[PDB]
Amino acid sequence: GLVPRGSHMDRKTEFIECTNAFNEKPKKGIPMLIEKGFIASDSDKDIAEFLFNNNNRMNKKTIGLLLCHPDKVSLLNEYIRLFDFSGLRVDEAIRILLTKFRLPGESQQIERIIEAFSSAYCENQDYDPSKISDNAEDDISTVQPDADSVFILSYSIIMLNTDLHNPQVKEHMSFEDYSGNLKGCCNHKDFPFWYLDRVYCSIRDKEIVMP
């Protein structure tokens, strides 16, 4: 009578009730989503897949806080994999990452997220060591930072994004300073000029944002 439904009113209503419970308390929301059949089971794989696919339907801040919880490393690791970071520079991968959830604010929380991201990022690449070069401009397969190196670069990228787009900054960080501070950070050696240059110019020309 009231709604055609096929506008799927009943499904939407329970989804809204379930997601509200999740945004409030994942500890309560997840089991409700499972009970209602929106999540297949209580496995990290099923929960991770649901979170990953419904990033624009639930509170991204809550999602981020759930993922960075010390005892949720298993979930975080299942979740981080769903991403395809293959053939992308670290900054391009970060942009993709931050479209699914919002980074938490505390030190140890950010660290847990970036650690998972860095390991996943490296796992997604085909690091053929014979290809390593400091001058194969624009050839992504020739720069192979290990997890610790990606972790450091990731922090530098978030840092740079803030500096270059902060109107309060008198003199935005120059490429020389951005790259200089990164010396010895690519497997204890330097990142190739072109890699940091493309990173720097990309961040400069398009702020990483939202969620």
Q: What is the CATH number of the domain that holds 45?
A: 1.10.220.20
Listed as own residue / partner, the contacts of 25-33 with beta carbons closer than 8 Å and 24 or more positions apart are 26/62, 26/66
- Asked if residues 63 and 93 have their Cβ atoms less than 8 Å apart, the reply is no
* Burial (Cβ within 10 Å: 0-12, 13-18, ≥19) of residue 54: middle
Please state how this structure was obtained: X-ray
- Cβ count within 10 A of residue 72: 17
**Residues facing residue 189 across a β-bridge:** 186
- Domain identity same for 78 and 24: yes
Q: How far apart are the C-alpha atoms of 162 and 91, rounded to whole Å?
A: 14
146 located within any domain: yes
- Asked if residues 71 and 48 have their Cβ atoms less than 8 Å apart, the reply is no
User: Can you tell me which residue has the tokens 């989804």?
Assistant: 15
28 located within any domain: yes
- Number of domains observed in the structure of the chain: 2
Two tokens, residue 154: 């990731």
Contacts of 100 (CB under 8 A, 6+ apart): 51, 52, 55, 60, 63, 83, 211
- Domain identity same for 200 and 98: yes
- Domain identity same for 70 and 90: no
Which of 83, 112, 132 delimits the end of a domain? 83
Q: How far apart are the C-alpha atoms of 171 and 30, rounded to whole Å?
A: 46
Two tokens, residue 174: 């120059």
Q: Which amino acid is at 146?
A: D
Which range of residues forms the domain containing residue 19? 10-83
C-alpha dist (Å) from residue 148 to 5, 33, 56, 66? 52, 36, 31, 24
5 located within any domain: no
25 located within any domain: yes
204 located within any domain: yes
Contacts of 119 (CB under 8 A, 6+ apart): 80, 147
Determine which one of 106, 123, 137, 207 is catalytic.
106
In the chain, what is the greatest distance between 2 CA atoms, to the nearest angstrom? Answer: 70
C-alpha dist (Å) from residue 52 to 41, 63, 69, 91, 98? 15, 9, 17, 20, 11
4 located within any domain: no
Two tokens, residue 165: 């787009």
- Domain identity same for 32 and 120: no
- Domain identity same for 133 and 205: yes
- Rounded to the nearest 10 degrees, what angle do helices 147-164 and 90-97 cross at? 70
Please give the full DSSP string across 16-61, using - where no structure is assigned. HHHHHHHHH-HHHHHHHHHHTTSSS-SSHHHHHHHHHHTTTTS-HH
Which of 45, 63, 83 delimits the end of a domain? 83
CATH number of residue 184's parent domain? 1.10.1000.11
User: Can you tell me which residue has the tokens 């010895």?
Assistant: 184
- Domain identity same for 126 and 210: yes
**Residues facing residue 186 across a β-bridge:** 189
Buried (b) or exposed (e) across 142-173, using 16+ Cβ within 10 A?
bbbbebebbbbbbebbbebbeebeeeeeeeeb
Q: How far apart are the C-alpha atoms of 172 and 158, rounded to whole Å?
A: 14
132 located within any domain: yes
- Domain identity same for 43 and 74: yes
Q: How far apart are the C-alpha atoms of 165 and 207, rounded to whole Å?
A: 7
Contacts of 66 (CB under 8 A, 6+ apart): 26, 51, 72, 75
Buried (b) or exposed (e) across 106-117, using 16+ Cβ within 10 A?
eeebbebbbbbb
Active-site residue flag, 24? no
- Domain identity same for 199 and 100: yes
Contacts of 178 (CB under 8 A, 6+ apart): 156, 160, 196, 200
Which of 83, 115, 140 delimits the end of a domain? 83
Rounded to a whole number of angstroms, the distance between the first and last alpha carbons of the chain is: 37
- Domain identity same for 76 and 101: no
Q: What is the CA radius of gyration of the chain?
A: 20
- Asked if residues 113 and 67 have their Cβ atoms less than 8 Å apart, the reply is yes
Rounded-to-5 percentages of helix, strand, coil across the chain: 60, 0, 40
- Asked if residues 189 and 198 have their Cβ atoms less than 8 Å apart, the reply is no
- Asked if residues 38 and 30 have their Cβ atoms less than 8 Å apart, the reply is no
